[PDB]
Amino acid sequence: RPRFSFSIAAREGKARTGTIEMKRGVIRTPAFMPVGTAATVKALKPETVRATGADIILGNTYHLMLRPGAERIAKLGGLHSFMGWDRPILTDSGGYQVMSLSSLTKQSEEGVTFKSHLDGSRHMLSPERSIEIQHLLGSDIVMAFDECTPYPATPSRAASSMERSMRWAKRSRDAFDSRKEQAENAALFGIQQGSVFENLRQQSADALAEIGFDGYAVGGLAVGEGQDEMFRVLDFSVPMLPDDKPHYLMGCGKPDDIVGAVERGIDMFDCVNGQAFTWDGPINIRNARFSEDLKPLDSECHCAVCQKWSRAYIHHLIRAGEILGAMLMTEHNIAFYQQLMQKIRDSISEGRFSQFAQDFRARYFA
């Protein structure tokens, strides 16, 4: 396999389906990436993550650099070996979690210094150091380091952070390229910023395309703006990105967010305890109504959890705070997301995705 090859096999409207080929495996798109925080997808062995249908997982750099440490992971053979996942891993830059989880943060044009939320130890991230950490982890898809824009943001502040992010995108590009082993074996994605402002989104897309990346993320969304606004911004933002590269929407999308985002040209998603997804909408398994319900979590789901255990049992486990409850809920939910992606891929391939989206929504929100 090549370092990186994105191929589009079929299209419907703005939606696309295809594959990303990388050295460690093929990723089917549109893709959902389960999130591994501190070198683990919560409550699941990697084999179970794979069994749900995942082709790639996300690793959170911020958590990894704190524990067990990036240099330590490299000494131990890299993240894949450490956690036992041998397929592609996309690593985030660490920037967002520094902003949201760390303390005593000090921002500058060079980067950010901060104190750990775990031990109060002092740490640093810059475009160069973020790219280096992602190299030390052995990441397959590296994210450029940027400066996030809070929602809501004034036009001036959104412009300032977008402009800094684009300067940092060039620094990320250059750091990645100067490291031969990384440049030859991994891919680098840039992140579009600009808040909800069309002109800033356009400037950001232009800057990123001029630098050139293997893929393009839409950053700065899923941060409190709501689905209507997110969809409105995606409507104008995604067409600004190069068509022939993957488009990655960063941040937890509910099933309905994913469907609408695919309708708007997004190819990749991520999303990190009593809520269970079903085709008739989410249920909270803690609800007393499930205490004697012998049906599986979802009536159609092909996951191992739905083949073997009842709502009543999972209700009991979750109410009791049992570890197996978290294990079963997480496996089902990730499996549900993967089945959603498969239905999306198949419907685009068959030119009936618009109908699928309508049918999905009618039932999910009935």
Partner touching 327 among Zn ion, a second copy, none, CB below 5 to 8 Å by kind:
a second copy
- For residues 364 and 280, the answer to whether their CB atoms sit within 8 Å is yes
94 is in an annotated binding site: yes
Q: Which is nearer to a second copy, 26 or 38 (CB)?
A: 38
Partner touching 352 among Zn ion, a second copy, none, CB below 5 to 8 Å by kind:
none
Stretch that binds a second copy, among 14-22, 37-45, 52-60, 199-207 (CB under 8 A): 37-45
232: left (phi over 0), alpha (psi -120 to 50) or beta: alpha
**Structure tokens that stand for 80 in this block:** 């894949």
Query: With breaks defined as C to next N over 2.5 Å, after which residues does the chain break?
Result: 272
Q: Specify the amino acid at residue 188.
A: L
> Does residue number 51 form part of the binding site for a second copy (CB under 8 A)?
no
Q: What is the 3-state secondary structure (H, E, C) of the chain?
A: CCCCEEEEEEEECCEEEEEEEECCEEEEECEEECEECCCCECCCCHHHHHHCCCCCEEECHHHHHHCCCHHHHHHCCCHHHHHCCCCCEEECCCHHHHHHHCEEEEECCCCEEEECCCCCCEEEECHHHHHHHHHHHCCCEEECCCCCCCCCCCHHHHHHHHHHHHHHHHHHHHHHHCCHHHHHHCEEEEEECCCCCHHHHHHHHHHHHHHCCCEEEECCCCCCCCHHHHHHHHHHHHHHCCCCCCEEECCCCCHHHHHHHHHCCCCEEECCCCEECCCCCCEECCCHHHCCCCCCCCCCCCCHHHHHCCHHHHHHHHHCCCHHHHHHHHHHHHHHHHHHHHHHHHHHHCCCHHHHHHHHHHHHCC
Q: Which is nearer to a second copy, 302 or 308 (CB)?
A: 308
- Active-site pick, 140, 257, 267, 270: 270
- Active-site pick, 55, 92, 214, 267: 92
Partner touching 56 among Zn ion, a second copy, none, CB below 5 to 8 Å by kind:
none
Q: Which is nearer to a second copy, 11 or 319 (CB)?
A: 319
Q: Which residue has the tokens 């990388």?
A: 22
Active site residue 270: yes
CB neighbourhood size of 325 (10 A)? 22
346 is in an annotated binding site: no
Stretch that binds a second copy, among 20-28, 42-50, 87-95, 335-343 (CB under 8 A): 42-50
Subset of residues 327 to 346 that bind a second copy, contact rule: CB under 8 A: 327
Subset of residues 89 to 148 that bind a second copy, contact rule: CB under 8 A: none
62 is in an annotated binding site: no
Partner touching 312 among Zn ion, a second copy, none, CB below 5 to 8 Å by kind:
a second copy
Q: Which is nearer to a second copy, 71 or 243 (CB)?
A: 71
Partner touching 303 among Zn ion, a second copy, none, CB below 5 to 8 Å by kind:
Zn ion
**Which of 74, 209, 312, 354 touches a second copy (CB under 8 A)?**
312
Based on C-alpha coordinates, what's the Rg of the chain? 20
Q: Which is nearer to a second copy, 309 or 364 (CB)?
A: 309
> Does residue number 72 form part of the binding site for a second copy (CB under 8 A)?
yes
Closest distance between Zn ion and the C-beta of residue 298, in Å? 5
> Does residue number 43 form part of the binding site for a second copy (CB under 8 A)?
yes
**Which of 1, 7, 75, 210 touches a second copy (CB under 8 A)?**
75
Number of residues binding to a second copy, judged by CB under 8 A: 33
Q: Which is nearer to a second copy, 43 or 99 (CB)?
A: 43
Partner touching 99 among Zn ion, a second copy, none, CB below 5 to 8 Å by kind:
none
What residues are labeled active site?
92, 270
Residues near a second copy (CB under 8 A) = 38-40, 42-45, 67-68, 72, 75-77, 82-84, 291-292, 294, 308-310, 312-313, 316-317, 319-320, 322-324, 326-327
Binding site residue list for Zn(2+): 301, 303, 306, 332
Binding site residue list for substrate: 92-96, 146, 193, 220
